[PDB]
Amino acid sequence: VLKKNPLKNKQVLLRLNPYAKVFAAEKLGSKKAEKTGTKPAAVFTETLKHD
């Protein structure tokens, strides 16, 4: 009789999408990224700062 909006109303957020519980549990939307230490080539930054 009345459309309730998921992204409000956590009950209808869980009626659809049972993974919404797990996403909020493992926080999954603010998850870290690994810190890799790649550096660009010399020709990339030289071309970037080129006139």
Interface residues with other proteins (CB under 8 A) are: 3-7, 12, 15-19, 22-23, 28, 31, 33, 36, 38-41, 43-44, 47, 50
Shortest distance, position 6 Cβ to other proteins, whole Å: 5
Shortest distance, position 11 Cβ to other proteins, whole Å: 12
**What letter represents residue 3's amino acid?**
K
Shortest distance, position 21 Cβ to other proteins, whole Å: 9
Q: How far apart are CA 9 and CA 4, in angstroms?
A: 7
How many C-beta atoms surround the C-beta of residue 42 within 10 A?
Answer: 8
Q: Is 6 helix (H, G, I), strand (E, B) or coil?
A: strand
